[PDB]
Every structure is written in structure tokens, then in C-alpha cells.
């Protein structure tokens, strides 16, 4: 691949094809066991989702082994979870220490005492949302250096070796494999890291006084095409909509709770264009 630098300076048959692709990639599994036996690690870097390929490798080959499957695309994953998992559930040694490199030192000292006890770990999306810092990659490369622990991992981002220096890349004794399936990213992109109807459904649950307050806000916003706090308080006090100022601050905090009006510095700007506010103002009549 050669990217041209000047652009920076000027700035059916598909299913059977994927089935044949997956059978071709399932042919590579005894070669992967022979490669993992000699001390290398497996890294896959194709285009499509390599989740199902690694899961079928775990089911069809590593069925009786100690396998820690780590979902790197999980947005609430931490290194504390993986290290607590290795020290507690596999090795029965309780909670790992709060220093994670000390926990990896403990894991090396404990796996030195048990030869012919191999921990496999399968990390879908090694460049995941909580493994893109340098410390987590240092911990994973220190884990991959142990002769008992073997590693399979997926790579999806385009800037992945920007955080692997040559020490991490010699610890990660990788065998790079082009496992390019064409499967879409359903399981990887579903999580938390990746309207006027909502405004009407929130306005359905309002009471009468809050309805009058938001009516005053939208009427002033559409008359003058944000609004101040003092004129709003005088408008709510002239219509007997409120008892004090702090009840207006409570109702405006309730409005900001539901993302209906936006406070600024107190400026009150409704973050939806004027035309849909005009349709909403004509909706009540």
C-alpha cells in the first residue's frame, strides 16, 4: 500500500462466496495449532468481522482448554477485569493487586510453577475502545511473552501499530494472517460508543404549569425568531404560573433533564430549528 502525500497537502452469490471463504479459513486451524505450539501468536487483520471465525476456532479446536475470551469492543472493559479474571477464576489467587504490572508479575510467577497448563486467550478487537492506550498494550504484550499463555487476536482499525513499539512487537511474537471475511460489524458496533417525536413524547408527560412555562418559552423564541431569565420570571409571575423563582429553576432543571431547552452563560436556547418549533406551536391549536 502506497498512500499519496499530495492529497494531505492540497486539503445470491455473496452468501456462497462468504461460505467458501469461511471454509477456506476453517482449513487453517491445524496450521494455527502448529504455529501456536512453537511460541508464536495469531493476529488477524481482515476487513470483515472476525468474531465468528475466532468463536468457531474456540468451539472446534480449543474445546477442552482454559480459554479466556475477551471482548475488546466492550466499552466497559478494563484491564482490572481481565487481570482479576486471570488471578481469581483460573489461578484461584483472589483479587489482583491495583498495580497492573505487579499483577502481571504475579501471573508470570504463578504460571512459572505450572508447566503443561496453557491459558489461551482470544481477544476480539485488540484495538478496542478501552485497549487503545499504551498501558493496556504493555500489559497484553507482557502477558503474551509467557510460554504458557497463548494469544489469538483481531485487528480492525487502520492505525493499530501506532501504539506497538519494537519492544511490544517482539513481546507480541505475532504471526500475521489475512483473514478477510466479508461479514458486517453487527456485534462490534452495537454497543454504547457508536427529535420532535421525542419532544412531543416528553411534553405529553408534563403538567399544566410546566406546559404554560414551556409555552411561554417557545412563544417568546418564535416571536423574536436565548431568552433572559428575568423576563421569563415576570411572564410566569404575571400568569400566576409559579410561586417563587426557585420553582422556575426546578422546572428549568427538569427541562434540561429531558433535553428540551438549553441553558447558557441565563440564556435559554431551544436546540431545534425555528420551523419545527413553528409546527409544534401550530400543533396545539
Amino acid at each position: 500500500f502506497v498512500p499519496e502525500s499530495d492529497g494531505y497537502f492540497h486539503s445470491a452469490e455473496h452468501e456462497g462466496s462468504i461460505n467458501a471463504i469461511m471454509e477456506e479459513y476453517r482449513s487453517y486451524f491445524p496450521k494455527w495449532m502448529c504455529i501456536l505450539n512453537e511460541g508464536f501468536n495469531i493476529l488477524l487483520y481482515g476487513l470483515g468481522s472476525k468474531h465468528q471465525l475466532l468463536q468457531s476456532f474456540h468451539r472446534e479446536v480449543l474445546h477442552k482448554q482454559t480459554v479466556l475470551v475477551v471482548n475488546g469492543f466492550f466499552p466497559s472493559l478494563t484491564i482490572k477485569d481481565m487481570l482479576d479474571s486471570i488471578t481469581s477464576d483460573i489461578l484461584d489467587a483472589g483479587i489482583s493487586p491495583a498495580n497492573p504490572h505487579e499483577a502481571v508479575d504475579m501471573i508470570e510467577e504463578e504460571f512459572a510453577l505450572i508447566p503443561e497448563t496453557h491459558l489461551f486467550l482470544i481477544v476480539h478487537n485488540l484495538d478496542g475502545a478501552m485497549l487503545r492506550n499504551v498501558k493496556a498494550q504493555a500489559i497484553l504484550s507482557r502477558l503474551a511473552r509467557i510460554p504458557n499463555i497463548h494469544l489469538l487476536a483481531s485487528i480492525d482499525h487502520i492505525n493499530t501499530p501506532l501504539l506497538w513499539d519494537q519492544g511490544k512487537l517482539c513481546s507480541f511474537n505475532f504471526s500475521w494472517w489475512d483473514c478477510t471475511t466479508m461479514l458486517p460489524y453487527t456485534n462490534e458496533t452495537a454497543f454504547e460508543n457508536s427529535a420532535l417525536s421525542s419532544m412531543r413524547s416528553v411534553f405529553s408527560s408534563l403538567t399544566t404549569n410546566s406546559r404554560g412555562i414551556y409555552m411561554l418559552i417557545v412563544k417568546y423564541q418564535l416571536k423574536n425568531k436565548g431568552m433572559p431569565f428575568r423576563d421569563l420570571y415576570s411572564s410566569c409571575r404575571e400568569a400566576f404560573l409559579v410561586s417563587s423563582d426557585l420553582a422556575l429553576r426546578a422546572q428549568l432543571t427538569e427541562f434540561l433533564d429531558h433535553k428540551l431547552v438549553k441553558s447558557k452563560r441565563e440564556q435559554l436556547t431551544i436546540p431545534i430549528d425555528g420551523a419545527l418549533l413553528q409546527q409544534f406551536l401550530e400543533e396545539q391549536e
Binding site: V69, N71, S76, D81, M82, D92, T117, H150
Partner: protein, 56 residues
């Protein structure tokens, strides 16, 4: 979907007899594995001996 696509956890332990030589016997007793083991151990011991004689 899958058993390992849980919304709560991120890690899944499949411990089978873990406490506090990956291949079978049918591949190791093949002669190319023994020959590769002997040749690689010879080359690695020679490279280690050369590095020792360099660093001593």
C-alpha cells in the same frame, strides 16, 4: 445472539481443570517435527553461544 455477547461482562473464563506441548502425539511422532526440533535447537544454541562469546 451468542453466549459471549453479554451486555454485562467483557471476559469469559472457560476453566477446565486449572490450578494455582500443545499438539497431540500423532503430530510429534512424525519425523519432520523431530527433525525441525533438532535443527532449531542446534541453531538457537549456536546463536546463543555466539552472543555469549561476543558479550563476555
Amino acid at each position: 445472539m451468542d453466549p459471549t455477547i453479554s451486555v454485562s461482562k467483557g471476559c469469559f473464563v472457560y476453566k477446565n481443570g486449572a490450578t494455582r506441548s500443545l499438539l497431540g502425539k500423532e503430530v510429534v511422532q512424525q519425523p519432520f517435527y523431530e527433525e525441525y526440533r533438532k535443527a532449531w535447537n542446534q541453531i538457537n544454541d549456536h546463536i546463543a553461544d555466539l552472543q555469549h562469546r561476543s558479550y563476555a
